[PDB]
Structure formats: structure tokens, C-alpha cells
Amino acid sequence: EPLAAGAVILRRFAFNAAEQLIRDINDVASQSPFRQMVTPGGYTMSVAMTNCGHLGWTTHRQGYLYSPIDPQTNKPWPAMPQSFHNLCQRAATAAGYPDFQPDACLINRYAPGAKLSLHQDKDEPDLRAPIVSVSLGLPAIFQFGGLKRNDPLKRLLLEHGDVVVWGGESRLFYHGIQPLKAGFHPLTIDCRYNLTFRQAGKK
Numbered sequence: 036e037p038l039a040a041g042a043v044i045l046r047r048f049a050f051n052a053a054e055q056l057i058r059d060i061n062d063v064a065s066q067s068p069f070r071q072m073v074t075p076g077g078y079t080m081s082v083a084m085t086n087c088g089h090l091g092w093t094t095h096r097q098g099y100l101y102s103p104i105d106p107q108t109n110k111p112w113p114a115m116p117q118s119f120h121n122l123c124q125r126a127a128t129a130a131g132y133p134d135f136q137p138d139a140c141l142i143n144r145y146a147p148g149a150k151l152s153l154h155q156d157k158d159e160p161d162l163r164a165p166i167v168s169v170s171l172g173l174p175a176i177f178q179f180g181g182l183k184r185n186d187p188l189k190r191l192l193l194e195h196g197d198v199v200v201w202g203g204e205s206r207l208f209y210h211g212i213q214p215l216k217a218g219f220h221p222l223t224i225d226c227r228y229n230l231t232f233r234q235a236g237k238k
């Protein structure tokens with residue numbers, strides 16, 4: 036589906052790769068654990084996060100940043116799993132962005148009730164690169180708007196395996212996730228995971 040200029044939803048695109056992706060999420064988290072962070076605004080996130088790849092995103096009360104080192108372990112974030120690399124390249128190509136080279140993958144874990152408030156991904160220096168966003172596990176309602184905070188929002192259920200890509204005209208569009216409804220999924224048990232691939236450094 037034609038989500039917006041430069042944006043698409045590839046439904047169930049990652050469904051066959053999901054089992055492998057979740058195993059790799061568990062491997063990454065065994066090294067750099069999921070943690071709920073606090074924003075510079077003083078807001079404690081309900082979504083727990085970790086990262087893999089060259090750069091990882093983290094935040095605390097004094098600011099946020101993309102760094103090659105996990106501040107909790109003082110060790111590099113785990114390397115990008117091959118399954119992650121392969122799926123991201125396939126999805127980016129299917130979405131019309133074949134030259135996307137991510138150097139960062141943020142892994143979000145949503146327990147029941149967790150949400151991610153409406154925001155823009157504007158922390159990356161090079162906005163020419165798209166965002167590739169993978170849904171795994173329990174279903175969630177994704178909000179996708181426009182360039183301005185008050186632009187009308189589309190509300191779309193994202194299910195296990197769905198992939199959403201945005202860029203170009205829609206690169207800075209506002210988006211978010213509504214509180215996750217509780218339930219059971221065989222592969223993730225009681226949660227929704229998301230993989231957010233980005234080019235966060237200079238290229």
C-alpha cells in the first residue's frame with residue numbers, strides 16, 4: 036500500500052524471516068540488554084530498547100546520541116545480524132530505495148500498555164536515507180501523519196511480519212505507536228518487537 040509520497044507498507048514482508056529475526060533479537064539482547072530510557076525532556080519511555088550495528092541510539096536526561104558503544108555495558112553494540120542485514124536490504128529494494136546502507140538498528144520491545152509518542156526521526160544527519168521499520172509479534176496501531184505535528188494522522192494496524200518504509204518527501208513525517216493491547220503470540224510471547232534500520236552516521 037501507497038502510504039505517502041516516498042512511503043510504503045509491505046504487509047507480511049518479513050513473515051518468513053521472523054523466526055530467525057527474533058532469535059537474533061534475543062542474541063543481541065543477551066549482550067546489550069533491553070532498557071527503558073529517559074528523554075532529555077525528562078520523560079521515561081515505556082518502550083524498552085537496545086541496538087545492534089555500528090551505531091546505537093540512547094538517551095538520558097542530559098541528551099541523546101548515536102554511539103558505537105552501549106553506555107550500559109561500555110562495550111560496542113553487537114554487530115548487525117546477517118538476517119537483519121538481508122531483510123533490510125530486501126525491504127529497502129522492494130520499497131524503491133535499493134542503495135540504502137544502514138549502519139544502525141534500534142530494537143524496540145513493547146510490553147502491554149507500552150507506546151511510542153508521536154515524533155519525527157530527525158536525529159540522523161543525512162536525511163536522504165529512508166527508514167526501514169519491521170514489526171514482529173503482537174499487533175499495534177501505527178500513526179503516520181505529515182510534516183507538521185498537527186497534520187492528520189492515518190492509523191494502521193501493523194501485524195507480525197509487516198514492514199513500513201518512508202523517505203524522500205515523507206522522511207520527516209510524524210509517526211508513533213499507540214498503547215499495545217495485551218495478548219499472546221507464539222514467537223514473542225507477550226510483546227511486540229520492532230526493528231528500525233537507519234543510516235545514522237555520515238556516508
Ligand SMILES: O=C(O)CCC(=O)C(=O)O
Binds near residue numbers: 156
Ligand atoms: O515501533 C515502531 O513501529 C515505530 C518505532 C519508531 O518509530 C522509532 O523507534 O523511532
Ligand SMILES: [Mn+2]
Binds near residue numbers: 155156210
Ligand atoms: Mn520513529
